[model samples]
Target chain A: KKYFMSSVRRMPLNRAKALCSELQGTVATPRNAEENRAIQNVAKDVAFLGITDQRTENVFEDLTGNRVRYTNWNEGEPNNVGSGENCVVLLTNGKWNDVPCSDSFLVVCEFS
Target chain B: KYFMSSVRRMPLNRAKALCSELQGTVATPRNAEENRAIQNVAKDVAFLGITDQRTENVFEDLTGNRVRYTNWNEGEPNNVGSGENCVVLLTNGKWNDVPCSDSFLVVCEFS
Candidate 1:
């Protein structure tokens, strides 16, 4: 499969997901620092990955329905601020943050 | 002699504003050498002092100095949408026009 970082486009998480789907790909799910860094190498701003916990509080899972095995949350983050932050973003520093799924952001994708 | 610091995760206006408050300004890579130097330290997309807010298609740095050198990415600065007046250095050492409100890391210069 080939992985690619999408151009910066401010959109809701659902819209981002749809766009990726149209491209015959899905939002990226980096399972390790090495994979995470690859995304950072091309990402200009905080970008959406394919991990979310919208179905349940603090039970984050990847797009493939696999539970996240490795994480790199920022200091004091994933606080689930306002009790609405369910989507995840890969920060410029390569750390992760949980934000409201409605917030606009760029996204990464992977294709077969 | 001068030095610089990388401030990550901020918008162009806020980054420039903060640099001004600290008695500095967002960096303006003066030449290929300086641009290369700046790229070496930036781990992510970084805001430069360059902007066209004052006049469309006329980019300049904070000091009112016109840009004499550039290394823009392919088909960049297309000005595809409104408010994409600010410039950012990509991780790949190329430049692109982005909205000022978009968040990014910044390179600040001190003298």
Candidate 2:
């Protein structure tokens, strides 16, 4: 459970992914509530998680290209807010929100 | 380790009252981990248990514990306009000085 958070940097999704790569990790993808809670336990800000529907609407995949088996979307979320919310963010409530990929947010990374 | 209420758009006072009614107190993060946990469970902005109402620039939690650790956003606690005594948790986990009357979501903790 080596989770890492970039200290309050606001960057677009690609930059975030690159930063994680530089750290020898990938953006986090929680497999369950405990894993999610583990990330939730350490993260202090609204951050980018390793899940997105960028390839296809309503189809989320993790950094490893695995289909997301678990989800915790906030109520009425993934509404694709503003028409281009392809990236996923772990909201303050540990729930999920679909935000535009270009929007800047903190990044969470995980090492094997 | 924490219990967060649903998104309740209310003033700090009302949020405190509701927490009391629930036999809890407004949330106070004692450590970085606890603080992060609270932030993770919060919906947008939330009223925290820390305030400087009693003395300017001196923040204390509900149990009178001195908040030794803080994660305030840069240039925060400015006490802007001289009436901002309460603390609110921003979505990014940074804290800001806010008016007590400002409505926001609430998070409660029990020990």
Candidate 3:
């Protein structure tokens, strides 16, 4: 019955979407650092966050396909490394970095 | 978010199932405004989307997650008879757990 559900299993963003299936939630976004840390605290390691630039290069948004409500990108990042760092993840430092959606890591989700 | 009602009454499980059929949800209140919005549609006592049927005292929403907001009636949710496991939103904007079989308004919220 907790609010957030995180998995230590490393998985792609596409795969992570279904992980929270029974939780009736989405790969949720954190509006502030405190909340972001709350999600990261579930497991102090890199975890797939729910934002991406897949819709438009260099512009990140959530599943709603709407503009971002918040951001904490790592320094000089979203460089679109190798020209396709579409998905994003939380580094151990709790800062976000653009990464390939195919990259696997811990998963985080939140219930509405 | 908007709360809409069927203008008819259904029991706890039925209400959520009905809401699901509508492609919306019988979600629990996330804040005071949302709660009041639900109450506004209820027009009176109504079943909320929270229950402890899975494990006693572990109140969760129909989405099977912990409720983020709660406004319990004074000394209520007493879980009377150990069977009063479903919650209801009272006219006063507070909560009280009751039997799941009891029929109440069916309110659905859509994003």
* Candidate 1 Cα RMSD after full superposition onto the native fold (Å): 12.7
Each model's Cα RMSD: 12.7, 13.5, 10.2
DockQ agreement of candidate 2 with the native complex: 0.02
Better of 2 and 3 by lDDT: 2
Q: What is the clash count of model 1? A: 0
Q: Mind giving the per-residue lDDT tens digits that candidate 2 earns over B24-57?
A: 5888887888888888878688889999988888
Q: Give the TM-score of candidate 3.
A: 0.50
**Residue by residue across A3-96, what tens digits does model 3's lDDT show?**
4556656889998776544324578678787778787777457888889889889888886687786898889887898858999888888888
Report the C-alpha lDDT of model 3 over B1-111, residue by residue, as the tens digit: 656555566788888775564345775788999988888877768888889899888899876898768999999879887479899888898999999998987666665
Q: For residues B16-110, what per-residue lDDT tens digits would candidate 1 score against the true structure?
A: 66555334578888887888777776778888889998898789987777898988999988888665889999988899999988998887665
In order, the first chain's TM-score in every candidate is 0.92, 0.92, 0.90
Backbone clash pairs for candidate 2 read A92-B40, A93-B41
Q: After superposition, how far is residue A49 of candidate 1 from its true place, in Å?
A: 0.9
> How good is the docking of model 3, by CAPRI class?
incorrect
Candidate 1 backbone collisions, by pair: none
**C-alpha DockQ of every model:** 0.02, 0.02, 0.04
